Amino acid sequence: MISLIAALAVDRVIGMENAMPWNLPADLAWFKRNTLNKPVIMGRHTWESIGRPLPGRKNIILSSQPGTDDRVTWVKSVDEAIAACGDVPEIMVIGGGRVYEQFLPKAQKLYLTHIDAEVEGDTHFPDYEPDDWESVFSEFHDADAQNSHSYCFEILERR
Numbered sequence: 001m002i003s004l005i006a007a008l009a010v011d012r013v014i015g016m017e018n019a020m021p022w023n024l025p026a027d028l029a030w031f032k033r034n035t036l037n038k039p040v041i042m043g044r045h046t047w048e049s050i051g052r053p054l055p056g057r058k059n060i061i062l063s064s065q066p067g068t069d070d071r072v073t074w075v076k077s078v079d080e081a082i083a084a085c086g087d088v089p090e091i092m093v094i095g096g097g098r099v100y101e102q103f104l105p106k107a108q109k110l111y112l113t114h115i116d117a118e119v120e121g122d123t124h125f126p127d128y129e130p131d132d133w134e135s136v137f138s139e140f141h142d143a144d145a146q147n148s149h150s151y152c153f154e155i156l157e158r159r
Ligand SMILES: NC(=O)c1ccc[n+]([C@@H]2O[C@H](COP(=O)([O-])OP(=O)(O)OC[C@H]3O[C@@H](n4cnc5c(N)ncnc54)[C@H](OP(=O)(O)O)[C@@H]3O)[C@@H](O)[C@H]2O)c1
Pocket: 005, 006, 007, 008, 013, 014, 015, 016, 017, 018, 019, 020, 042, 043, 044, 045, 046, 047, 049, 062, 063, 064, 065, 075, 076, 077, 078, 094, 095, 096, 097, 098, 099, 100, 102, 123
């Protein structure tokens, strides 16, 4: 099964100038929990943003050009990226905006963190059709001394 995981600020903003304009340790811990020991597919810009491999995950990078780091796997299309995952129970697509748009139709599951932050952005999560999805998990957290925004972890399943 293909899943998308992403954290969205207001207006579905997910990035600005190739970075995520917030700092939420608890959301990065959620990302790690829900991705460790699964393949992760990302676009080249997200690869550059993260800046290093995510350990304990097969990292698959989409790029039209030859790869530039053999610590990760490089592929040139959506279907090649899926194939490179092999026979696994769940493939995690970890962005960015352009990659999320292409995997959305194939995805059966969304793991979305809805962060209460106002962020100028230049990259968005897709404007997906809400009627396609049923929320099956939802957990809101107030801001605290480590996490400067409130946020809500939600899992949605394709109806
Ligand atoms: N908040 C979150 O949850 C979250 C998650 C991930 C990323 N982000 C943010 O999102 C931003 C990056 O997103 P982005 O939309 O600019 O870029 P992206 O989706 O990460 O990367 C796009 C790149 O991937 C390659 N690619 C995409 N689809 C392909 C295909 N079908 N075949 C071959 N190559 C393909 C291309 O590389 P080539 O140009 O080499 O062909 C392309 O330029 C950054 O700000 C980042 O911090 C936020």
